[PDB]
Nucleic acid binder design. Structure first.
Ligand SMILES: [Mg+2]
Ligand SMILES: [Zn+2]
Lengths: 79, 49, 1362, 277, 49
DNA sequence: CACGTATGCTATAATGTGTGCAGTCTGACGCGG
DNA sequence: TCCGCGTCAGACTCGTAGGATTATAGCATACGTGA
RNA sequence: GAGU
């Protein structure tokens, strides 16, 4: 994850999409303060996102799922 | 280049004919240049500057 | 702020007034005393806005308290000062003026549209002569020029009923009155009567101009300027220097010129001045406008006091210094540093030493933000002062921020993408960057004072781009060839070589060790040398048929050194790979093997380990360079005295007047060339195996451990060629002429050169060095053109679903297999079920990436040739599919969709050339040519198989070949080509076709420095058109008197015998001609220029005798300088100077008629019965002999092929493979690996456009050239709708024109030719919807490729759905 | 064919006939009385005089063509104000107008920053003085050496020689290498860079946040005066417009807000730290 | 990093606020290009979305 | 009114430019006679 | 249709130093803004 | 002038 990204690339596949997915997750931890799944072990948001993708916890589709889950529950609360 | 006279020739200017056209150049220290040169039809021409 | 597309069209007078916020009526800039703008001047604040934010001039309204207020007193709007770079103005011209770009910039546009020659328009413009705008009396016709006195005649006579005018007014009125519709239909009607080729081009040209003019909604009047726009002040600034001086833009001097002359013209008109004066002022106005728009275009550019021409508007868009090249496709960039680089051998492959002071400043805002989060800094000013004071806590923060943060290192020049790599930084005290050794190769970085540039990726996106795409650990393999670019060099190789290599007994021969750890223990304990031959027990780990790794344990007979290196070796690799004495070539294969078995992590760690151990043992070794390491062979002075008596023999034979000067020159050079080889071989036997000094029983022989030999042999440094100069003979030097000096350098560098040997060395040296400085620019220009034409090409789709592909075959250039089929085809999609010989079982499937395992199977099955999916045969429109491309060579797997392939291709092709232009030139010194190819010797026994050969038996009894292109194959037992050679014309074959030959036997023999003309018939020689003085010359010797005849060519020939072709005609004993067997051709061999003839007129000959000997001077260094022009001519699709003739259609050949020797060809095919004729020059000789079944594109005459003809007759695969092979021949000659698929990318871009011959259901019609993508998409909708189908022909385009043919005019203008591109686009009213990369970089947006492909396709769907 | 604007114009003037004294007087009588032909013939005939004079006033400010047009305008004024009844010849009279008009135009257009005739003529007399001084003082003349000669103020001489400092072009490259010129080094001073812009954002947001921590009345009497939260920057007496309507009580509460905020900067770690700033 | 004037300051403030957000716009050199081309009397306009 | 800025007028006769440099660069690709 | 003249291109970053020159008469009456 |  830190040194070699190959296994993280092998989870998603497209290097280009790996970058977009890990950037969107890292933005969540950077700004939202969304809690990390893997122990940080004193690492930056970018590295945490890559570990999370390597172990197969974060995914474009999974992010989109939790986006509608939380947005729909807030719509429910407003009405 | 020292002023004086100089005889030169592009070895095959037109690559089609490949004919060697000889030319002269009189180079002064101050003044106009005086050029003499051959054409393909072997006619002597003069050009100033 | 975010827009979709960009349009260019003609500026209407009205349109120019829309932008303007005021008319500038004065040349005044500012007041001398209050440096404030002058009223209605060039810097007027009343027009262009306030100088200070929210402040009027006189200072009545200040700050946001007065928002949009227009000061009544001074007349200045109170707004942001920002507007002074934004607002434009204008000038009212008293006389109209031509817009120089649409007048001088060819095609003339204004002339082309009026069908009026440029000279004619100008004579009208400079008021030399009148032009008729409408002669109602057809007595006088339109656009007819009348001189001053011609106007006086018609003036009284006709007058009134003819209107003729002068200057810009006249042409503008002529443009205004012309009706584009009516003239369009008129010209279309004329086009139908007799459309000759050039007449139809010019007519179609004006048709497209008229059509495009009505579609653009541009009007012809607008070519003439009545309103003149003024650029905003801040974009042409007048700013004060510190020293009280001012500095201003040149535009201000040019604007002042124009305003003064224009206002003077207003004056002269109010004053009713006489006409000659009016005219001169109108000329002056046109001169000043022309100077302002494009200075050095029409005549002398107007100069400043410095002599230098003032920089005009056009100059600020145009060329390198212009907006595009300098400020828009490349930029100055924040968060960038540079310093010296030095080694960091302690670093791991993902790291770089980053100076503390440098990093403190690069990460300044990150340190301030962290300082506020710790509450150490109250505010930003306090944070700033804390970092200025460099407080102890600040370093700990800096250390915190840089962890896990990648930084980019860049080296100039950036030739391929590996010129930039990302590392994790390691803070170091000290001002130099530390670079990892193993990536020195990619950067071409040597630490003789090199400097590198540092960039900080700021955004989370940028950081992840750096860590995932650009990290050094992630980018090992060259994208150009599938090869690891990260390879140990120099000290590393030397150390490993030293450890692995074995020695006779030495310390502790024949011992037995428990593990490699006991071996290490024994060596460092001092009871064993690294070269002791001892048996050790190692357990190697071999991978099984499944994922599970198998372990095996056995006794290996290696040395102590190899055992210790096995400790660095990962489990999974076999022990046999390290068991040989290791060199640079073996270590690269080590890394390759590691990569394919274990994968990335193991290879990275392994590489680092290899570097550590390599250095470590290099230093232990104590390796050094003393002068005793340079060993001269004892037998130098004998070899030289001998070679010197020999050269004296030929000098004596010259002085006797027998041997010519040229023959002696050649034979002296041959004597010395052989002496040099012999001395070098003597040195190398004496040095290589000089350890004849061993032990145990008695004396034994072994490899020498001489330092310089170890260095060369390991491949760490030097080579045998270098050692020749050091210890041997230096050899023959080359003059700046290219010609070789007759007297070589007998001495070596250890011996020391004398004044003359050193002086002679100089020439070659400095030629080399000058080549580095000067030639690197032609190579780079080629890189630039290539990049520009392959820009847009990106992987768009996964699978195009095409069945198409090129049938590749094994490459056997020279003799050694240069490019194996597997190597040529590896990692390429296999199109069409390609099985084994016996067509009765499918061997391989369809869409299947060729992996190394699959390729290994191809060799066991002995596959002849394979159809492979190519970029050229992809159906994907606006890009290519991952399948047609195949593997990303740099990744080692199938390419990802979104990757920008074209740029990669152009970089890959361009870089070697550009870098090789510097390599063999700073270093390029000694001249070592080799072209003595006299005889071909076969090695493997086989049956002789010749192809395309027409030999004839001679008097001697040998098979003399009479064919130009003759190839010789080497069939084995079963029957398959193993070896291949090139037999030239007039070669003597030992055996014939089908005859068996044994191994190590001369099959072919000939003379290299000569091209003979050999006959096909026997009889006597006749002289035709060989008049002495006109065509040939004559020179005799003594007592007997043998004269030779030398044929003069058009260079040494008079105008008398120009149309005379000199030829040696064959005749019989009677005097009549001799027919060539089975043809109606009387025997006549045409001799070319500088052809030396020994037989004079009236000499008897047999078949196979040599008539004349054409000289073949080819004593060149080839190198690179010469190869890249070939490559550039190929990519630019230049038709060669004498192209070969090819058959257009299949059918039966019929010869016809002759026009005084000029060959007509009345060719009549079978089904297409209508005849086809072609004229052929008299002297051009055909290889084929008529009356033949000809395929489309059979070679008729020998000569080079034009790529256009190839495409037109044998289609895309033919021309693609011609370019691929012909280019690859050059790079292969220089040992450069480039995959064919890169050249195939560029070829595809060359074949972008196609010319429609015959109408579709759209408005294509005859002769339009459109992109093949768009017409195929049209043909998809035609197939569904039927209607008239569109018939077309694909066209080949050279790189430059192909880049200018892209619909994107921003891309076209940014490349080159910018003045012309923007006039063409402005007149067409062209709209660029910004699809390409170039275009997006210019507007500063997201690339439509790589990371950006996700976002860019999400925009494209937002665009598709509204 | 000649397409040189100059050669063409010179050709045109060449082929108009030179006048004698009596011709000049006859034409000119009708010309003053308003004869379209007369003025034209006198002008067109005497264009060649204009060119002879404009050739003497060359290589200075404008080019030959430029000079010739302004010279023509001088000849025009001469034909308009010529006195035929005076025995004096036309050529003598016109000489004055052409030299005059050319000189005056070369004073307003020759300089990118327009210098008024008064400044220019002043300067010129200082310059010709300097030439005489340099011719007896070998070494060039100082500002005071010129001032000493005219008995005039040193500041007058120095201010005028300052105005004579001629412009440099932005686009003119430096260092013989046509690489980077003045534009390429000359930085935007007016518009400062993001460190300063972001400092001001932090400063303005700091004081706005300090009012929230200060007394509501103290924050509604200090911010609206300076124009930090208000719309208009008011003064001590002007804060009476809002709700305060006081003169003593506004002045005490402004300064009471300042005293508590000065201790907020002494404790956070600025005060004398941000005094140097 | 270069021209975008809004972008650079906004980006700086984001960096000090930890959030490495990209807030880009249009480089000021392109705006200039347009103005230079219209000063030539060629209409170059942006057609928006 | 004044201070700065501009416009004006001269009366022997004078009536067709030059002026300071450029130094030659080169291989390619179109475009009028 | 071929000679001739024109226009257009000719690697990438780094350094250094700052800048030059000429000359426009002399005096008498206006034109414009603040007071 | 510094590394190509
Ligand atoms: Mg170096
Ligand atoms: Zn105002």
């Amino acid at each position: 994850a830190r040194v070699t990204v190959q296994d993280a690339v092998e989870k998603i596949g497209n290097r280009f999409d790996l970058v977009l997915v890990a950037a969107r997750r890292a933005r969540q931890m950077q700004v939202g303060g969304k809690d990390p799944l893997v122990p940080e072990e004193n690492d930056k948001t970018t590295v945490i996102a890559l570990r999370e993708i390597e172990e197969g916890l974060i995914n474009n589709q999974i992010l989109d799922v939790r986006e509608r889950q939380e947005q729909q529950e807030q719509e429910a609360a407003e009405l | 280049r020292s002023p004086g006279v100089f005889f030169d020739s592009d070895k095959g200017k037109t690559h089609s004919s490949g004919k060697v056209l000889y030319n002269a150049r009189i180079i002064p220290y101050r003044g106009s240049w005086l050029d003499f040169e051959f054409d393909p039809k072997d006619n002597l021409f003069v050009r100033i500057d | 702020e975010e827009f979709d597309a960009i349009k260019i069209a003609l500026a209407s007078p009205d349109m120019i007034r829309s932008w303007s916020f005021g008319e500038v009526k004065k040349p005044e800039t500012i007041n001398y005393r209050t440096f404030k703008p002058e009223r209605d001047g060039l810097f007027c604040a009343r027009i262009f806005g306030p100088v200070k934010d929210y402040e009027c001039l006189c200072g009545k309204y200040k700050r946001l308290k007065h928002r949009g207020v227009i000061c009544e007193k001074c007349g200045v709007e109170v707004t942001q000062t920002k507007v002074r770079r934004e607002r434009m103005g204008h000038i009212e011209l008293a006389s109209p003026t031509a817009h120089i770009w649409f007048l001088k910039s060819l095609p003339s546009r204004i002339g082309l549209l009026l069908d009026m020659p440029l000279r004619d328009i100008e004579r009208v413009l400079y008021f030399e002569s009148y032009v008729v705008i409408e002669g109602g009396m057809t007595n006088l016709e339109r656009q007819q020029i009348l001189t001053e006195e011609q106007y006086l005649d018609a003036l009284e006579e006709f007058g009134d009923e003819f209107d003729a005018k002068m200057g810009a007014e006249a042409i503008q009125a002529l443009l205004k009155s012309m009706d584009l519709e009516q003239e369009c239909e008129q010209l279309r009607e004329e086009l139908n009567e007799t459309n000759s080729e050039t007449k139809r081009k010019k007519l179609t040209k004006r048709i497209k101009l008229l059509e495009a003019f009505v579609q653009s909604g541009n009007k012809p009047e607008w070519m003439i300027l009545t309103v003149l726009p003024v650029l905003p002040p801040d974009l042409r600034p007048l700013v004060p220097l510190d020293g009280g001086r001012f500095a201003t833009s040149d535009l201000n001097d040019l604007y002042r010129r124009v305003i003064n002359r224009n206002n003077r013209l207003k004056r002269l008109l109010d004053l009713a001045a006489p006409d000659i004066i009016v005219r001169n002022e109108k000329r002056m106005l046109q001169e000043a406008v022309d100077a302002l728009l494009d200075n050095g275009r029409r005549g002398r550019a107007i100069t400043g006091s410095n002599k230098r021409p003032l920089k005009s508007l056009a100059d600020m868009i145009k060329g390198k210094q212009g907006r595009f090249r300098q400020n828009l496709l490349g930029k100055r960039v924040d968060y960038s540093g540079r310093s010296v680089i030095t080694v960091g051998p302690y670093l791991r492959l993902h790291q770089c030493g980053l100076p503390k002071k440098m990093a403190l400043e690069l990460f300044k805002p990150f340190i301030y933000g962290k300082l506020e989060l710790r509450g150490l800094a109250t505010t930003i000013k306090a944070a700033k002062k804390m970092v200025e004071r460099e407080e102890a806590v600040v370093w700990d923060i800096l250390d915190e921020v840089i962890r896990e943060h990648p930084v980019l290192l860049n080296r100039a020049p950036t030739l391929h993408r590996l010129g930039i790599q990302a590392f994790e930084p390691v803070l170091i005290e000290g001002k130099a960057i530390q670079l990892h050794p193993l990536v020195c190769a990619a950067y071409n970085a040597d630490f003789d004072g090199d400097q590198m540039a540092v960039h900080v990726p700021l955004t989370l996106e940028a950081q992840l781009e750096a860590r995932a795409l650009m990290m050094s650990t992630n980018n090992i393999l060259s994208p150009a060839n599938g090869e690891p670019i990260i390879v140990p060099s120099q000290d590393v190789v030397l150390g490993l070589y030293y450890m692995t290599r074995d020695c006779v007994n030495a310390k502790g021969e024949g011992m037995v060790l428990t593990g490699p750890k006991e071996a290490e223990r024994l060596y460092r304990s001092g009871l064993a040398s690294l070269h002791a031959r001892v048996k050790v027990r190692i357990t190697e780990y071999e991978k099984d048929a499944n994922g599970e790794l198998v372990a095996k344990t056995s006794l290996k007979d290696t040395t102590v050194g190899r055992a210790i290196l096995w400790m660095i070796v990962p489990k999974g690799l076999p022990y046999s790979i390290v068991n040989q004495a290791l060199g640079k070539k073996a270590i690269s294969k080590m890394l390759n093997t590691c990569y394919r078995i274990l994968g990335l992590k193991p290879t990275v760690i392994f590489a680092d380990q290899i570097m550590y151990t390599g250095f470590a043992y290099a230093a232990r070794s104590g390796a050094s360079v003393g002068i005793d390491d340079m060993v001269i062979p004892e037998k130098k002075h004998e070899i030289i005295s001998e070679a010197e008596a020999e050269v004296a023999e030929i000098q004596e034979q010259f002085q006797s007047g027998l041997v010519t000067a040229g023959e002696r020159y050649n034979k002296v050079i041959d004597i010395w060339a052989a002496a040099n080889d012999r001395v070098s071989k003597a040195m190398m036997d004496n040095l290589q195996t000089e350890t004849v000094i061993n032990r145990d029983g008695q004396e034994e022989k072994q490899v020498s451990f001489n330092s310089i030999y170890m260095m060369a042999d390991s491949g760490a440094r030097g080579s045998a060629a270098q050692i020749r100069q050091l210890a041997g003979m230096r050899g023959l030097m080359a003059k700046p002429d290219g010609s070789i000096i007759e007297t070589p350098i007998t001495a070596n560098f250890r011996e020391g050169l004398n004044v003359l040997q050193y002086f002679i060395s100089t020439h070659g040296a400095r030629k080399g060095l000058a080549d580095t400085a000067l030639k690197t620019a032609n190579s780079g220009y080629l890189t630039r053109r290539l990049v520009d034409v392959a820009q847009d090409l990106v992987v768009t789709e996964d699978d195009c679903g095409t069945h198409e592909g090129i049938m590749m075959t094994p490459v056997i250039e020279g003799g050694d297999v240069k490019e194996p089929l597997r190597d040529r085809v590896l990692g390429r999609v296999t199109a069409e079920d390609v099985l084994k010989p016996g067509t009765a079982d499918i061997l391989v499937p369809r869409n299947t990436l060729l992996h190394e395992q699959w390729c290994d199977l191809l060799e066991e099955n002995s596959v002849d040739a394979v159809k492979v999916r190519s970029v050229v045969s992809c159906d994907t429109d606006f890009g290519v599919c991952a399948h047609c491309y195949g593997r990303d060579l740099a990744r080692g797997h199938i390419i990802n969709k979104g990757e920008a392939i074209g740029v990669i291709a152009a970089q890959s092709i361009g870089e070697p050339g550009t870098q090789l232009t510097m390599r063999t030139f700073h270093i390029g010194g000694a001249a070592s040519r080799a072209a003595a190819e006299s005889s071909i010797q076969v090695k493997n026994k086989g049956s002789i198989k010749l192809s395309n050969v027409k030999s004839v038996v001679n008097s001697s009894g040998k098979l003399v070949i009479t064919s130009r292109n003759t190839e010789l194959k080497l069939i084995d037992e079963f029957g398959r080509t193993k070896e291949s050679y090139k037999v030239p014309y007039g070669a003597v074959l030992a055996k014939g076709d089908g005859e068996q030959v044994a191994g190590g036997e001369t099959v072919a023999n000939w003379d290299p420095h000569t091209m003979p003309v050999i006959t096909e018939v026997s009889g006597f020689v006749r002289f035709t058109d060989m008049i002495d003085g006109q065509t040939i010359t004559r020179q005799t010797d003594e007592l007997t008197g043998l004269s030779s005849l030398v044929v003069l060519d058009s260079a040494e020939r008079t105008a008398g015998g120009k149309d005379l072709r000199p030829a040696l005609k064959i005749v019989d004993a009677q005097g009549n001609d001799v027919l060539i067997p089975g043809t109606d051709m009387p025997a006549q061999y045409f001799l070319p220029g500088k052809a030396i003839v020994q037989l004079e007129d009236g000499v008897q000959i047999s078949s196979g005798d040599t008539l004349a000997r054409i000289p073949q001077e080819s004593g060149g260094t080839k190198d690179i300088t010469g190869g890249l022009p070939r490559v550039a001519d190929l990519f630019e699709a230049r038709r060669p100077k004498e192209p070969a003739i090819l058959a257009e259609i299949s059918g039966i050949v019929s010869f016809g008629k002759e026009t005084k020797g000029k060959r007509r060809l009345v060719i009549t095919p079978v089904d297409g019965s209508d005849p086809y004729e072609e004229m052929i020059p008299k002297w051009r000789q055909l290889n084929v002999f008529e009356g033949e079944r000809v395929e489309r594109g059979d070679v008729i005459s020998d000569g080079p092929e034009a790529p256009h003809d190839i495409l037109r007759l044998r289609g895309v695969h033919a021309v693609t493979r011609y370019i691929v092979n012909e280019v690859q021949d050059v790079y292969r000659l220089q040992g450069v690996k480039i995959n064919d698929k890169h050249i195939e990318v560029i070829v595809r871009q060359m074949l972008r456009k196609a010319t429609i011959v015959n109408a579709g259901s759209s408005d294509f019609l005859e002769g339009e050239q459109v992109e093949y993508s768009r017409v195929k998409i049209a043909n998809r909708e035609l197939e569904a709708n039927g209607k008239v189908g569109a018939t077309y022909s694909r066209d080949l385009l050279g790189i430059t024109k192909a880049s200018l043919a892209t619909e994107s005019f921003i891309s076209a203008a940014s490349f080159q030719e910018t003045t012309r591109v923007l006039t063409e686009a402005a007149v067409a009213g062209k709209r660029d919807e910004l699809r390409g990369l170039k275009e997006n970089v210019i507007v500063g947006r997201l690339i439509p490729a790589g990371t950006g492909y996700a976002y860019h396709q999400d925009r494209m769907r937002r665009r598709a759905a509204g | 064919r000649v397409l040189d604007a100059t050669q063409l114009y010179l050709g045109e003037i060449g082929y108009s006939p030179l006048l004698t004294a009596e011709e000049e007087v006859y034409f000119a009588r009708r010309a003053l009385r308003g004869d379209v032909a007369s003025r034209r013939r006198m002008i067109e005939s005497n264009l060649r005089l204009v060119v002879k004079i404009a050739r003497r006033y060359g290589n200075r400010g404008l080019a030959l063509l430029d000079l010739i047009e302004e010279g023509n305008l001088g000849l025009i004024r001469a034909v308009e104000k010529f006195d035929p009844e005076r025995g004096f010849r036309f050529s003598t009279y016109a000489t004055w107008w052409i030299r005059q008009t050319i000189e005056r135009a070369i004073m307003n257009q020759t300089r990118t920053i327009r210098l008024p005739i008064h400044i220019v003529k002043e300067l010129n007399v200082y310059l010709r003085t300097a030439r005489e001084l340099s011719h007896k003082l070998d070494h060039e003349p100082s500002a005071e050496e010129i001032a000493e000669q005219l008995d005039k103020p040193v500041d007058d001489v120095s201010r005028m020689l300052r105005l004579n400092e001629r412009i440099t072009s932005v686009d003119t490259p430096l260092g013989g290498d046509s690489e980077k010129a003045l534009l390429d080094i000359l930085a935007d001073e007016k518009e400062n860079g993001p460190e300063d812009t972001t400092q001001d954002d932090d400063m303005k947001q700091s004081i706005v946040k300090w009012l929230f921590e200060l007394n509501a009345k103290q924050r509604e009497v200090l911010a609206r005066r300076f124009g930090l939260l208000g719309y208009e920057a008011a003064t001590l007496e002007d804060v009476g417009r809002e709700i305060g309507l006081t003169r003593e009580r506004v002045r005490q509460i402004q300064v009471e807000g300042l005293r508590r905020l000065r201790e907020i900067l002494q404790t956070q770690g600025l005060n004398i730290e941000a005094l140097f700033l | 990093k270069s021209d975008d004037v809004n972008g650079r300051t906004k980006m700086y403030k984001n960096i000090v606020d930890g959030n490495h957000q990209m807030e880009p716009g249009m480089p000021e050199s392109f705006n200039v290009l347009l103005k230079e081309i219209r000063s030539l009397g060629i209409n170059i306009e942006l057609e928006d979305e």
